[PDB]
Symmetry: C2
Subunit: 229 residues, 2 copies
């Protein structure tokens, strides 16, 4: 069973997940208090335990680094991977290092403003926006989205559409093809599974690779963080 010191911390409202190896002849215990990840360290004497953050000589917070790869990083890879597997529209270089997925609607004003805010990073080749289109906001939203997906170079059309503030003229097909309807229905389902209703719904990866989310028009700060700044 658990060492007494660690059991006393467990009584202060913590639930242990597992144990890990800590430096100095110390055992580590990974736990949680409600949503928060917590690291406990049993002292060599085996008689004391420290609930806190371990830092190394370079200043890296090892406790936060770990609490991220073990509690946070994981659950949102199926999601980053489910986005990669959808039929997204490319905006920028395909070799661009920073990847940002965005759920957009043809009739969403903020989708356009965010698109403008990102020009610099996209153009520099540092960031590529991968748009997952949906048609949920207006009556003509599915028709317009389908039309954009019907165009000869969808990605280009979408870029022009956003650049022209939604005033870019389109050719309307007699009907939404089945494959287009599927891309729209599948993207709509993924977006729903993400709890993302207001658009633009922005998804990106942190410096430590955990699934981040931005909804609506980002402010300067959230914008630089999304773009890899």
């Amino acid at each position: 069973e658990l060492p007494a010191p660690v059991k006393a911390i467990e009584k202060q409202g913590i639930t242990i997940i597992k144990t890990f190896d800590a430096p100095g002849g110390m055992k580590g215990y990974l736990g949680k208090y409600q949503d928060m990840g917590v690291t406990i360290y049993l002292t060599p004497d085996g008689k004391h335990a420290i609930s806190g953050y371990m830092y190394n000589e370079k200043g890296e917070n090892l406790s936060n680094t770990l609490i991220e790869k073990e509690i946070y990083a994981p659950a949102g890879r199926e999601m980053w991977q489910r986005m990669e597997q959808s039929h997204w529209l490319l905006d920028g270089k395909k070799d661009a290092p920073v990847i940002v997925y965005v759920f957009a609607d043809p009739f969403c004003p903020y989708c356009k403003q965010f698109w403008q805010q990102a020009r610099p990073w996209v153009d520099s080749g540092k960031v590529q926006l991968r748009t997952l289109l949906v048609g949920v906001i207006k009556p003509e939203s599915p028709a317009t989205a389908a039309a954009i997906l019907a165009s000869k170079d969808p990605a280009k059309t979408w870029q022009q559409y956003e650049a022209s503030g939604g005033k870019l003229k389109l050719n309307v097909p007699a009907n939404v093809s089945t494959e287009q309807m599927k891309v729209l229905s599948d993207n709509e389902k993924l977006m729903d599974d993400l709890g993302a209703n207001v658009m633009p719904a922005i998804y990106y990866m942190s410096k430590e690779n955990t699934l981040q989310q931005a909804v609506g028009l980002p402010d300067q700060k959230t914008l630089n963080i999304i773009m890899g700044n």
Copy 2:
């Protein structure tokens, strides 16, 4: 100079106060982040440091225990000692273990209600209230306070006064004697030095002996905590 791990925590906004002996072959460092006391523990390897709370086998938070006797407990003993040295009115047994100082005014409604709330503990012999009178609220406040201090058994008179909701009749002296005026002026100065303007201003000691303060009419909880419950 400081071990690198501890220096990295210092850069995260902490100011070290001193070092102390920690169990397990670990050095401890007592510090502060703004107002908050913090304990850092250098690992045996001398290469890692943990900013957090140390618990022992019995569940005692050693870090909080210490951060209290070293950062909190101290500054308010001159104050607990300055109160003891003032001419306070006794209400209860002089051997009562729990001591509560209260700054009261003859014309303060809440002073009366708090006085009623405390009857039980006082009567049981567990708590003694030591009243430091002042005359600051009303025009006739100094006259009434002085009169209460002029009475033959001031403490008793004060108790009756509070019990009778301020309706206890008093004998008004021709003048506030010099010693009475001094007790009132001295208590007024101490109260001011304490930042205590609204009354009743209640002062008591915690389980770990640090100077606590309650202002106004306490709720059931603050009331039980003040009374040693």
